[PDB]
Amino acid sequence: MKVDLNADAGESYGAFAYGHDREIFPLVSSANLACGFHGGSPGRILEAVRLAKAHGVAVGAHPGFPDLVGFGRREMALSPEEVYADVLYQIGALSAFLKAEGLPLHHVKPHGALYLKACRDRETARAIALAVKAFDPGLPLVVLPGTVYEEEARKAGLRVVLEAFPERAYLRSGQLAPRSMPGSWITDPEEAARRALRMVLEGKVEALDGGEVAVRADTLCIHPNAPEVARAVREALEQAGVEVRAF
Amino acid sequence: MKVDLNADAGESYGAFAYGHDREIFPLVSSANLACGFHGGSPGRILEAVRLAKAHGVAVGAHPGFPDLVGFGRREMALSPEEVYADVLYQIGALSAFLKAEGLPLHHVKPHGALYLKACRDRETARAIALAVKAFDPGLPLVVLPGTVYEEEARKAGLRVVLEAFPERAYLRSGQLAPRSMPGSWITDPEEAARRALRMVLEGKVEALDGGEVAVRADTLCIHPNAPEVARAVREALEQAGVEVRAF
Amino acid sequence: MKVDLNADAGESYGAFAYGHDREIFPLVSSANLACGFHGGSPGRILEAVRLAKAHGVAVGAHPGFPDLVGFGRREMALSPEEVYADVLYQIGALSAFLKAEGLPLHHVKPHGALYLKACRDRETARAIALAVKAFDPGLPLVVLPGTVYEEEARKAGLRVVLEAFPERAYLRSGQLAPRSMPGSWITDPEEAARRALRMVLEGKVEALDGGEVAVRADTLCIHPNAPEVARAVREALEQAGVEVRAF
Amino acid sequence: MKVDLNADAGESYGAFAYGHDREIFPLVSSANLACGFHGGSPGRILEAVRLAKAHGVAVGAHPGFPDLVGFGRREMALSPEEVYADVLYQIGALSAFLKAEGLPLHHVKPHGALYLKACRDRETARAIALAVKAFDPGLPLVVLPGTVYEEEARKAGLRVVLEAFPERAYLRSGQLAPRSMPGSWITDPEEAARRALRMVLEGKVEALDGGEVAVRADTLCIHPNAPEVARAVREALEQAGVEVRAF
């Protein structure tokens, strides 16, 4: 069986280095690159694309809100029209670097607060979906299963890719546990790898509030010690005979 | 005979409306749209592209320095690597809006200080040329004839388009007269139209410092009262039997 | 009797001219100057301060959200800590220009979405109040009467200035009528002037949903045709024997 | 004898942590804090000011060019008017945080390319000097000795503070050796400390191109392994009986 391992990257801005792209790229099969709004200045995008290419990592767009200082982690009251234009702008900018390096745009996955706004706001979700569709109808959109975001993406006629989080706790409802909830985030790479295997091999994950829940992981998202977690997860999957490859 | 009339557009940023796109688009055959660095926020780009499409105007990229407050009119010590990445980023962003609207990217023409830096700096000129070539080898680059900029563009293997300025005075050397030089800028739309016709029909323009100089105008650049000048110029050309069409 | 007439100003950014400061300054007694976040680049701030000084207009800070493209008109999920720091930064920046021109900082009044967030969010309101207090305990804060914003400002120990809007319709509740509600905004300068006089002379204004409501106007806020409205309002007040002066 | 040890700080921007303020502050007597243009977002400024206060470090403004992505390290063709306004804006913004924390603004020292432009351009140097003077005539300006920058500062009537660089090689001319010149930068903290002592105790430093040159160090500037160098330098000075205190 196979699964895609994805991680955010190229979020550095100018002189401000961010993340551990060098350590993460050799472990993942796909990367979500920032497009200059919440991170990723032009030179850093070019650098990240070159790194991904060198490591045979598939590159997708990681569009976000126009809030650099806030790293796109803050909710912003953008109109659907503004979301559509901002997403198009970002996808296009990244695609130029991929074109220069002879690589295709693999997917699109919203970043931070935009992602969250999409998961609970139909108009925002629809705007993202239409922007992606208008750019390339064939582009897959990474979404959180069971959300209005997955719904609008499907209604738009886009191919959807289901994401799972081995580092985040799940609730019986099938949705992610609230951030600051005791035990909401799995820190031990060993358990995360354990959970990852389970999600792939069995399509299920333990639930924080009792029992377990079903989850179909087309791709597994990886976050500090991210390299360690990513390492642990990839190894557990490969030692298990699971192929880690871009979706 | 035919000639292209081009003007900058889509330079508005957010709530800050700029220029007279509505009045200029029905007069020109090509437009140079800002890409978010010295002007042109995403929503304004989308708006300008829609307007151009409605008026059958060809759209090209107008990349500039990353200096919004300065409107990209200030020289910046960008390394060639930075110029290359910034230009790619901008061309890509604009191309996404054209793709959504089913339009092709017609050309590329640097804006303000970047344009000027290119005209006198070989490394900058080369960086712009390579960025354009890396994105689409078939993209024509608008340049100032007789400059190192035209040279590097040709050395890069790109198709070059020669620009002339009916509103600017020329010197016997064949280059544009210094900005603050007495009589450097033609304000009377009548004379500008007069000069425009001459450049097209005869391939020559009066020189400020005596006599006249040769000029091949594949395209004529148009700037306040820009609409009046553009109007006067287009009419003089059409009443003369000259076809105004995108190059 | 006397009253202060205030209007926003200095919102231009770089090459992007905004508003009609030249036409408005000779009509108002106080101005709320942008501080570089939603508008007002350094050069434009300096320009606005010089203009105010030339016209003997009192200058206050008009801090907003860090959203230039959105003109600070979009709600942003800033933490109270972030609101506090952003407001301090802005007040300080403007105060430097006033110091250079030998003028005092007259007041503080939040801009756009920040203002609205303050009117309904106690933590945001408190953060603004504390920032102002930390900079100068003696600085008056302009607020909307009957809001949690007025409450937190008073709880913080700051002097509060009550603002009224002759151009906006009021509801019996005493609060402003919703923006897109039929008849929510008074366009006729004559009626606005009429309402303005009433608010000053009688401390009351007609209510959109029947009868009238009480309103104490320490200052009257003025907005396109803003100059006309401002003109009409100031004249109605002066021809009525009401002194227009900074609070 | 006494001397001031200064280092840049507070350059982090939003989520982008930069430098080693925590390690450097306990070693220096003065810090040059970024003001939001080339680094230092509002929250990070507040954080740096709090840290300095906790460590009894004197805080000065470190104004720079409006080039965040370039970290203010790139030459920009700002007019003297623009330099003046930008510097005022920045000094004012930082002063608000100092006021809130009950601390005075200790000095002003330009950052990166602005600093370099000032050292060779009289109009830029004058603009900086006048901005500082307009804000507070009593504010000392840190300058490079023997430059047009020191000259304009003195002509402006400002108190000037002479800076020396124990980590940079000097030429017989008395000016700093070119960056990429073999041996231009002292990496060994031991030698840097050695040089530092010499500059203080003897007012001289070895010259790269032979012999030595005179240098009066009112303050010593400290830069990766900056903490190590700063540590080595402070210890060498204290073990030598030299008092490290703000000028």
Swiss-Prot record, chains A, B, C, D:
It comes from the Bacteria. Catalyzes the cleavage of 5-oxoproline to form L-glutamate coupled to the hydrolysis of ATP to ADP and inorganic phosphate. Forms a complex composed of PxpA, PxpB and PxpC. This is 5-oxoprolinase subunit A. PANTHER family: 5-OXOPROLINASE SUBUNIT A (PTHR30292:SF0), UNCHARACTERIZED PROTEIN YBGL-RELATED (PTHR30292). It comes from Thermus thermophilus (strain ATCC 27634 / DSM 579 / HB8). HAMAP family: PxpA. The gene is pxpA. One of its GO terms (molecular function) is 5-oxoprolinase (ATP-hydrolyzing) activity. Gene3D superfamilies: Glycoside hydrolase/deacetylase. NCBIfam families: PRK05406.1-3, PRK05406.1-5. Belongs to the LamB/PxpA family. GO terms for biological process: carbohydrate metabolic process. Keywords: ATP-binding, Hydrolase, Nucleotide-binding, Plasmid. Its EC number is 3.5.2.9. It catalyses: 5-oxo-L-proline + ATP + 2 H2O = L-glutamate + ADP + phosphate + H(+). Pfam families: LamB_YcsF (PF03746).
